[PDB]
């Protein structure tokens, strides 16, 4: 049993291009991309919590890590989407 992000990438693809598919190799590219960004953000959040002597990684460390790892405008949009998701989840 090997896990991947394939079904989630495909769901987002159907949201964005309902009549478009994806080849197996491109899906592999996407899995590499998701794992890469996960490790970048999570590692920076780990370093942030450790620098400040905190035991817990919170959405604040994730947000700061996003501001550090992502270029300018992409960072703003990602922060908007993260805070949005967190507030939606909290109200639900």
């Amino acid at each position: 049993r090997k896990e991947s992000y394939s079904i989630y990438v495909y769901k987002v693809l159907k949201q964005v291009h309902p009549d478009t598919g994806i080849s197996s190799k491109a899906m592999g590219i996407m899995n590499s991309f998701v794992n890469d960004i996960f490790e970048r953000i999570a590692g920076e959040a780990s370093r942030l919590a450790h620098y400040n002597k905190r035991s817990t990684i919170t959405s604040r460390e994730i947000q700061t890590a996003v501001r550090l790892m992502l270029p300018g405008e992409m960072a703003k949009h990602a922060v908007s989407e993260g805070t949005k998701a967190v507030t939606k989840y909290t109200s639900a």
């Binding site: 942030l48 620098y51 400040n52 460390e61 700061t64 501001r67 550090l68």
Partner: protein
């Protein structure tokens, strides 16, 4: 009391200072347009480093940029600095 507003300080990076930097880099002859170009390059570099350092400062809920904020920002760009831990 408060500092008078800081303006136009990239010009503090003077032509003689740029020349000395180039000398340490082994440069013998310098075209007249190098100085403005060097100022632009330096300003971009310093902006990027300071932006990341200040991000570290603000995450720590501090108002004082520390040497370690700068060190983390420099490591952040793949430029490990020794001597300020």
């Amino acid at each position: 009391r408060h500092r008078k507003v800081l303006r136009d300080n990239i010009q503090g990076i003077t032509k003689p200072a740029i020349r000395r930097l180039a000398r340490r880099g082994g440069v013998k002859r310098i075209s007249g347009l190098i100085y403005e170009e060097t100022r632009g390059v330096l300003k971009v570099f310093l902006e990027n480093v300071i932006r990341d350092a200040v991000t570290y400062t603000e995450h720590a809920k501090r108002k004082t940029v520390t040497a370690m904020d700068v060190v983390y920002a420099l490591k952040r760009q793949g430029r490990t600095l020794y001597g300020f831990g």
